[PDB]
Amino acid sequence: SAMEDFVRQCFNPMIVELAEKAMKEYGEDPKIETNKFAAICTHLEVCFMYSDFGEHRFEIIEGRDRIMAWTVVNSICNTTGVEKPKFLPDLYDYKENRFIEIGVTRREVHIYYLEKANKIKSEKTHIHIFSFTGEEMATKADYTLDEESRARIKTRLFTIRQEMASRSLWDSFRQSERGE
Ligand SMILES: O=c1cc(Br)[nH]c(-c2nnn[nH]2)c1O
Ligand SMILES: [Mn+2]
Ligand SMILES: [Mn+2]
């Protein structure tokens, strides 16, 4: 375990349960694919923190069953006309009226930005990338959040990294490119 112990100690139970459900759907064992497990929890938590930093500004799409995620996406499209994305995004921004894809990477933010923009191939979805180094990259350099909220996300990601490092897990996690 070790990685599993750390995941259960640093993420709240709701997130852990959501991550285990995601992995039981994919067919993957969180006791085996430990680095994926941690990356899923981290990404889930960034999405929830992002949303929570809003007069009810964000709708969370990530973390729901696919049925219900698509139900939410469809509802938003029918009530705004916003083009329906091709891949499930992570949040909807009602203030700006755009979907958001959140990326968390152990590599350089620009590399992973390029990789996500190339994947989603949709000019509609705003993209926001975070590293474990306090760096971010976002479409048009439009970061959406205020400094406080982005700083809190940066802090938590760095803290997770240092917690992994103190437990000797960071090097495997960093080289694992799995989940990001
Ligand atoms: O950032 C992400 C990385 C991976 Br790998 N997958 C997703 C995803 N999968 N289904 N909905 N979102 C992300 O948002
Ligand atoms: Mn997602
Ligand atoms: Mn994402």
Author numbering: -1 to 52, 73 to 198
How does the study describe this entry?
A click reaction between compound 14 and sodium azide results in the formation of tetrazole 4a, a commonly employed carboxylic acid isostere, which can be deprotected to afford the tridentate MBI 4. Among structures, compounds 4, 8, 9, and 10 break with the chelating oxygen triad motif by replacing the carboxylic acid oxygen with a nitrogen atom. Interestingly, instead of incorporating a more distinct twist, this structure adopts different metal–ligand binding distances. Interestingly, several nitrogen-containing isosteres were found to have a bridging water molecule between the nitrogen of the hydroxypyridinone core and a nitrogen from the isosteric groups (see compounds 3, 4, 5, and 9). Compound 4 showed activity comparable to that of the parent structure, possibly due to shorter metal-ligand bond distances. This is perhaps unsurprising, as tetrazoles have been widely investigated as isosteres for carboxylic acids.
Among the most important influenza virus targets is the RNA-dependent RNA polymerase acidic N-terminal (PAN) endonuclease, which is a critical component of the viral replication machinery. PAN is part of a heterotrimeric RNA-dependent RNA polymerase complex, which is composed of PA, PB1, and PB2 subunits. The PA subunit, which enables endonucleolytic cleavage, is composed of a C-terminal domain that is mostly structural and an N-terminal domain that is catalytically active. In native PAN, the Mn2+ cations are coordinated by His41, Glu80, Asp108, Glu 119, and Ile120 and five water molecules, producing an octahedral coordination geometry at each metal center.
